[PDB]
């Protein structure tokens, strides 16, 4: 029983969820060295987002990702994810940052593609809207930020699916 107890106390994966997210939102202050849960937070990032893990790995032999890597990461990612399109301002999203940006774009795209179920016909808003008729309405209810909304949707659904995974 001591062995069983120990083993269970060991292999105890923390949840994804908050800390996973938070690693992009709830983590905007400590611009110093290795912040809180440094290794823990970065691994939460890696499981949370492949792109940053890949970029950091690619930038091991040169360009240290400790201070300068994370400094440029602030600009690049924390503009890419999270808040609005920085577009202008500090466009430090360079080299690996920009490359991974380009990647992650279509990457999240293909992920979203990999997400589409044929939802059970109670909720099927798609078949619900307009796909009964062929009608002529009006519509009257300005780009950007729609991407923000898709971002939060995509984050949440990725989280939940990483949990339906039954890993």
């Amino acid at each position: 029983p001591l062995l069983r107890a120990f083993a269970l106390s060991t292999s105890q994966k923390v949840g994804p969820y908050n800390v996973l997210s938070t690693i992009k939102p709830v983590a905007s202050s400590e611009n110093k060295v290795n912040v809180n849960l440094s290794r823990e937070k970065i691994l939460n990032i890696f499981e949370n987002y492949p792109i940053v893990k890949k970029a950091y790995t690619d930038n091991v032999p040169k360009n240290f990702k400790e201070p300068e890597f994370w400094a440029r990461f602030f600009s690049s990612k924390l503009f890419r994810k999270l808040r609005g399109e920085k577009i202008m301002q500090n466009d430090r999203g360079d080299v690996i940052i920009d490359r991974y940006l380009t990647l992650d774009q279509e990457f999240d795209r293909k992920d979203d593609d990999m997400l589409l179920h044929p939802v059970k016909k109670i909720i099927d808003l798609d078949g619900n809207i307009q796909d009964d008729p062929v009608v002529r309405g009006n519509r009257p209810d300005s780009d950007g930020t729609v991407d923000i909304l898709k971002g939060m949707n995509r984050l949440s659904e990725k989280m939940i699916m990483a949990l339906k995974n039954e890993y």
Binding site: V119, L125, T145
Partner: protein, 754 residues
Amino acid sequence: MKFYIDDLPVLFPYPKIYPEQYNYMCDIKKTLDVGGNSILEMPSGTGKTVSLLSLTIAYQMHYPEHRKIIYCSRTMSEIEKALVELENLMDYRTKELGYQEDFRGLGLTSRKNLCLHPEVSKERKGTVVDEKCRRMTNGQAKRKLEEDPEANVELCEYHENLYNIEVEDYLPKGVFSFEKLLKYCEEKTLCPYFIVRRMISLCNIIIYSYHYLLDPKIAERVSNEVSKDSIVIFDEAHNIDNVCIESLSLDLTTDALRRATRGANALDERISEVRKVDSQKLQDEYEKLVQGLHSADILTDQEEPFVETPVLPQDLLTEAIPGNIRRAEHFVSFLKRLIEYLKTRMKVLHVISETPKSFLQHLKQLTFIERKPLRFCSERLSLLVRTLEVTEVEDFTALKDIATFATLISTYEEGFLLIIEPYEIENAAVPNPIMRFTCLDASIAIKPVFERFSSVIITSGTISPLDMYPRMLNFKTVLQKSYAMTLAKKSFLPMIITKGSDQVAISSRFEIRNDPSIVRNYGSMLVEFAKITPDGMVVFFPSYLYMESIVSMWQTMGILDEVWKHKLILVETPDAQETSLALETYRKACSNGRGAILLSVARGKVSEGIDFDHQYGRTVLMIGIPFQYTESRILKARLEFMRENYRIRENDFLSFDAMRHAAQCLGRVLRGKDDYGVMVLADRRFSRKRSQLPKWIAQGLSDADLNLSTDMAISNTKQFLRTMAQPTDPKDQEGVSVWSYEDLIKHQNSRKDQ
């Protein structure tokens, strides 16, 4: 249960009952006894669907006359809601009775949500899918295939298996909800669409959306076999008038006009090439015009009809030749003149609105083209295309747009009104003139059904006041009754949060813009609620642009970070597919641990049919009160018609509409009486409208709960949530408000027979 209504066995599927349901049954039966309409507001807190279906099924299956039932829920979502519930009722009825069913009842929506052909249904836009199924199984491509066996013609073959076995007989016996129908007809490889569509002649009770009833462009196949006498039920009828109007209005944009120009050029090419190849058939069709309206193949068309008849169903149509239009080249020239006149009138400087008669005379002035030939343009174009047996329609979409416009503006009068807005002021001073055309009188679209059917019902969990509808729709009623939520407990907390913490009156009325006082106030409200309510919360902004700006600059502040820290956010976005996906994830999160917030638009698709049960909704909000005149003056024109034709002033009608949508939003958060949930509002103006609300909402909204600040609001709702959480189940006070199995109703009201 199996009680009686002094003649009617009622196989109500539940052991329990509700009192309001019993009153509902009594009164709806009383209606069906004597031909009337008798709108009935039954709060959605109960089960209106169960009562409706149970009583009506029992009536139809007990008396020998009213053999058919028509049920028109607003959207296919509620279509399948009624369907699944009806299926469960049917199973219960058989179970209690054995087998005395012989019953069929079918849903009916459209191809896009039914076509099972893999490649065909892979398409997105519903019109395209319709066209594809038409070509793949038409009266003509079949001939091309059979006479000429070749790779050119393929087929769903589902239509073929139908042709083999289904059109001799029917589906086995069930009231197939779309889940069941799709599964079965996938197994037996059928085409569900044509199945139900042909089946209409046999279903005991039919459920289809409003459009199929009022949209004349698809309400064509109404085969008086369907009723001729039937009992007809409008569920969720508070949004009727807008369905009529949207079924009769029409839009025009110069770009579509140029599209029509291109289509006309393609038409010239097609007519040239075919008359080079074959014109004798064209002259034969000339003769078939000269004999009459060509109903023999302009109407006796199992698969043909191309351009629908946007005019009312053939009532306002003549049958002679369209005179000179008999010549196809003549017709193309007519459309050329029409489109050019439309273009030049489109280049008009500023806003201008005209009666259809005035515009008609003006066209006559510029080009003497008469009304009578003009009316026939729709079927003329359609059957001309059939004679052309074209390979595609996309080139002719604008052509059919213009045909519809011509037919409408040439047919009706003194109820409609044109308007030519040269731009969109929200991005004013740009090239975008729109030839907006719309109706004003809602009664026009309805009038045929109230003419046709005798016994009709109107029902919603929200209708108020119960007199605006007789006014607008101009129809006679008998029983205009409202039902009160007899509850042994509070069960929900309407509030009016007029003042935030700053004790400042708030709304969305000021602009569609920012005013950081208002923004910060709302954000505080939202976040404290997100802290306090358990899983599941909704909000209903008054308009989409409003939400876009508000949330954008909420994200500007840190406000969204906190609600992120507590619950999930799931926004509402214009594309329907992503919306459905977000909504289902919202449900999945609510029933899971993490609480989740869905924020949508009151006018939007979400409020229309989606339901919010116990878990999925606790605390709706109404950020602001929904109003429309943000945008242009089409409402102004319709309201002008309203004031002149009905003794109704502007703000009266506007408030009425706003409270209509508010009540429709609010009612969603309850399903049974076990459910519960806060229903806050937020605006200064709400306080005076307390009487506009539906009764059962008003009762719970005591006087002391008016213009509360956010802080006292949070206090009260905290106390509520705690109190409701208690298992307050005396089960003897529930003998008052549940009328238990077979007895308390029997005893109580069999004595109340006084």
